[PDB]
Amino acid sequence: YSNQNNF
């Protein structure tokens, strides 16, 4: 699993 949250 890999995730990036760019607010």
Side-chain angles (χ1 to χ4, degrees):
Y1 177 103
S2 302
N3 183 72
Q4 186 185 57
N5 293 313
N6 301 316
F7 286 93

